[PDB]
Amino acid sequence: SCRVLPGDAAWPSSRDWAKLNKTLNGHLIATVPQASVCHKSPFGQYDAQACEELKSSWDISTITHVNAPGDVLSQNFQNYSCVPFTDPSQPCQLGNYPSYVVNVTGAADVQAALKFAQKHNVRIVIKNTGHDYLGKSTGKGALSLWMHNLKSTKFIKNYKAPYYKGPAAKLGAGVEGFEAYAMANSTGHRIVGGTCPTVGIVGGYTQGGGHSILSSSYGVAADNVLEWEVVTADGRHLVATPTRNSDLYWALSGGGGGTFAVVLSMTARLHRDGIVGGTLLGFNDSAVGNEVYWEAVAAFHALLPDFLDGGNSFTYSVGNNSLTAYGTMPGADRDAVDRLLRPFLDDLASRGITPVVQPRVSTNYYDHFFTYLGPAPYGNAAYFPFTNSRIIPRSLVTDPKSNAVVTDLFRNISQVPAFSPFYCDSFSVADKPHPANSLHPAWRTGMLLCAPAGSWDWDASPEEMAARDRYAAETLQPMMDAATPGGSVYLNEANHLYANWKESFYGDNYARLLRVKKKYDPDSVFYVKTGVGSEVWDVDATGRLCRA
Ligand SMILES: *Cc1cc2c(nc3c(=O)[nH]c(=O)nc-3n2C[C@H](O)[C@H](O)[C@H](O)COP(=O)(O)OP(=O)(O)OC[C@H]2O[C@@H](n3cnc4c(N)ncnc43)[C@H](O)[C@@H]2O)c(*)c1C
Ligand SMILES: *[C@@H]1O[C@H](CO)[C@@H](O[C@@H]2O[C@H](CO)[C@@H](O[C@@H]3O[C@H](CO)[C@@H](O)[C@H](O)[C@@H]3O)[C@H](O)[C@H]2NC(C)=O)[C@H](O)[C@H]1NC(C)=O
Ligand SMILES: *[C@@H]1O[C@H](CO)[C@@H](O[C@@H]2O[C@H](CO)[C@@H](O)[C@H](O)[C@H]2NC(C)=O)[C@H](O)[C@H]1NC(C)=O
Ligand SMILES: *[C@@H]1O[C@H](CO)[C@@H](O[C@@H]2O[C@H](CO)[C@@H](O)[C@H](O)[C@H]2NC(C)=O)[C@H](O)[C@H]1NC(C)=O
Ligand SMILES: *[C@@H]1O[C@H](CO)[C@@H](O)[C@H](O)[C@H]1NC(C)=O
Ligand SMILES: *[C@@H]1O[C@H](CO)[C@@H](O)[C@H](O)[C@H]1NC(C)=O
Ligand SMILES: *[C@@H]1O[C@H](CO)[C@@H](O)[C@H](O)[C@H]1NC(C)=O
């Protein structure tokens, strides 16, 4: 009826766990949260010096945190169970963290863990980096398939398929953005990946869609997938391609992580590298007042279409008084950058704004990326646990009427100090060749992906963070939704309590996604919150998974 929890009569004995540990060649880990050094029981590992080092970067996406077996990055899902900022005498508890972690070395480890979990009625969790904003990579009382260490990279000079011919990279499931970029750069190529360097490229990133500053040139991450190597729920080690287990390939390419199969690697398109044009472009209200500022943002938005259609992108911060943008202009030299920027600069000029404009040309993509989103290799990307999103259709922006509503939404969010400023990315991803995939159609009509993100506050109460959580899901996200009809919520950047997840994340694709889910996982061994087919499991008050 329900998944077993620590404390249950039916929880596996330590002998059961040892027997799994043997099968796994010693690769079972009992979860000990990284902040156990900040507490006294039950791990008896208290260390004030090490506790203090954890504090200064805890709210950053760091390699240190990503390297922990059972930790996730979300302060909200940590949920004060074993964190560096509570009383030392407060017991270091697992809470939402999995009980045991399978340190996966290949297909056999997964097959073993799946057999064990199915024999013993244990919840499977899948964790790669722990970046998930929706907690989809933790679970109380769970055995976790920890994919972080599957780091193999393989350059394929001449991938040969009817629908793709050219360079490709086969990447293990734990390969992170910075690893993918180092690997692609060394061969004279670019790969489509996230702006946050520590993000797992093969994980929930590509599986859930995956936007990039390179998307205007090469589509979303999932568009660039050639092959998925997987283990299915019943333990079959398979390869999914457009011409083999194609329905699984379709679901995995934009249908979301952690529900269809356990991914061991992906093979993806590489693209020839070269000169990359870049800029800082910033403007504020200090000379024109706030009203002209918001009209200038409205106009900046309206001016994107031709810039994006030329293969370029803007990633930018929208504040209450200033906008700061970083431009990505692949293959553009300095004269080309200038011509590309001239419409935006003329618009600001006509509105009495003196922008901050800092154009450059990088030799390669890697250099461009880490100039703007560094430092290399890990970056410095803050973790905001109340991340929401809207994919905003081009047609909304290009009509002044509907664009006014878009602008008015951004003004409203700018008044909410925990959610301001916020980042947007801009892209054109229609009419590029890619295989059939399950990527939400709003991506094709979309021009903006904006992520209003609420920071965590270690001085605030738990009740205040819980209130911020409910605010994001039931007030801020629906306000965003209503202001942008025909758009959608990016499944990777949403709140776990957001009520309209099914329609907004998946849309009309959902029936077919559900058919694929029932084909490859008929017993629903894979569960993630807001995942395809997740409505099979209820989460009770204590956090136990029970069959709906
Ligand atoms: C934390 C963070 C996230 C970001 C950042 N920047 C992004 C950007 O510029 N563009 C984007 O499109 N997305 C950005 N994201 C979000 C990530 O795209 C999502 O948060 C992804 O879900 C991240 O995936 P991953 O790195 O794998 O993190 P996990 O929490 O480990 O997994 C998420 C999800 O996927 C399942 N899963 C992962 N790996 C597997 C394998 N191998 N097999 C099966 N299932 C897998 C997990 O179960 C979970 O459900 C910038 C920042 C700072
Ligand atoms: C942080 O930890 C607390 C536990 O201290 C979690 O609170 C629990 O949250 C769930 C869902 O919000 C509550 O379940 C609800 O129970 C009622 C019956 O009482 C049921 O009718 C509802 O449908 C729902 O399932 C639960 O009561 C609550 N428990 C307590 C003690 O507050 C919280 O979810 C954790 N936060 C995160 C982000 O993990
Ligand atoms: C599962 O098996 C391995 C057996 O080696 C355990 O890993 C060892 O853990 C001890 C601590 O007790 C360390 O001192 C060693 O470094 C590890 N062994 C080796 C050979 O390196 C692991 O702890 C076991 N886990 C569980 C949950 O039973
Ligand atoms: C998870 O498993 C991997 C592979 O068994 C471990 O990687 C080894 O770690 C040691 C350092 O402790 C290195 O000297 C070896 O070169 C690594 N082996 C391989 C094949 O990469 C990894 O340390 C384990 N991690 C945890 C947290 O248990
Ligand atoms: C990227 O690759 C080139 C050769 O392809 C190499 O010379 C250069 O050092 C690399 N850059 C970085 C920053 O690793
Ligand atoms: C606003 O823009 C002006 C002119 O570009 C610049 O000098 C100034 O530093 C900016 N102010 C803020 C607060 O960003
Ligand atoms: C902005 O705020 C007003 C007043 O609170 C509200 O009525 C309106 O719906 C909001 N506008 C948008 C575009 O969401």
Author numbering: 27 to 574
What does the literature reporting this entry say, word for word?
In the present study we report the discovery and the structural characterization of two novel flavoprotein oxidases from the thermophilic fungus M. thermophila. VAO-type proteins are composed of a FAD-binding domain and substrate domain. In both MtVAO615 and MtVAO713 the cofactor FAD is covalently tethered to the protein by covalent linkages.
The crystal structure of MtVAO615 with amino acid residues 27–574 was solved in two different space groups. The structure at pH 7.5 contains one monomer while the structure at pH 5.0 contains two monomers. Rcryst/Rfree are 19.5/23.5 and 23.6/28.0 respectively. As already observed by SDS-PAGE, MtVAO615 is heavily glycosylated, showing electron density in 2Fo-Fc maps for N-glycosylation at Asn47, Asn105, Asn129, Asn211, Asn310 and Asn438. As expected, MtVAO615 harbors a bicovalently linked 6-S-cysteinyl-8α-N1-histidyl FAD while MtVAO713 has a monocovalently linked 8α-methyl-N1-histidyl FAD. The isoalloxazine ring of the cofactor is covalently linked with the C6 atom to the Sγ of Cys222 and with the 8α-methyl group to the Nδ1 of His157 in MtVAO615 and His159 in MtVAO713. The groove shaped substrate binding pocket of MtVAO615 is solvent accessible and contains, besides His157 and Cys222 which tether the FAD, Tyr159, Thr221, His237, Thr341, Tyr352, Leu399, cis-Pro401, Ala402, cis-Pro403, Ala408, Phe410, Thr413, Tyr449, Asp451, Leu475 Ala477, Ala479, Glu519. On the other hand, despite having a bicovalently bound FAD cofactor, access to the active site of MtVAO615 is rather narrow. In particular, Phe410 and Tyr449 seem to create a sort of funnel. No other suitable reference dyes could be obtained. These observations indicate that the redox potential of MtVAO615 is extremely high for a flavoprotein, around 120–160 mV, which is close to the values reported for other bicovalent flavoproteins.
